[PDB]
Design a protein around this ligand. Sequence first.
Ligand SMILES: [Zn+2]
Ligand SMILES: [Zn+2]
Ligand SMILES: [Zn+2]
Ligand SMILES: [Zn+2]
Length: 112
Amino acid sequence: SLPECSHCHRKFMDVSQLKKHLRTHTGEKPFTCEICGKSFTAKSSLQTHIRIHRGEKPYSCSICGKCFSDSSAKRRHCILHTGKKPFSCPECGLQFARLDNLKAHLKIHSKE
DNA sequence: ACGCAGGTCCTGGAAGCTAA
DNA sequence: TTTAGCTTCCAGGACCTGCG
Ligand SMILES: [Zn+2]
Ligand SMILES: [Zn+2]
Ligand SMILES: [Zn+2]
Ligand SMILES: [Zn+2]
């Protein structure tokens, strides 16, 4: 009997996580950047965005040393040092390291 | 041309914490 | 002391972009 959203009927760990999810249906962004004025849905997104203004890149690759202000961009980059390409085109067989690029490569097949 | 990869921010579960 | 509900943190992903 986890807290269930009345709109989309999905459930969450506690009532505070549901209240945070309520904003995905309303579009409310209550965390505003003081520098540029852009607003964000979560405080952790605002803290990440502020590091862009200040040039703070604490996330660095242990293999090549490339630095990132965004922890997900660093996590996404470090995978490239493994060379894995787990996404294969169903039409031509071209393999991609990222699903975003196969999505784009399926468009060129759609327009043939 | 188009594969490649970084920029940016949204979403939610995990974990840590406060206060009822 | 307990623990519901709060804040923080982290992993993943969507969408965009410019480069070689
Ligand atoms: Zn909902
Ligand atoms: Zn800003
Ligand atoms: Zn690297
Ligand atoms: Zn293809």
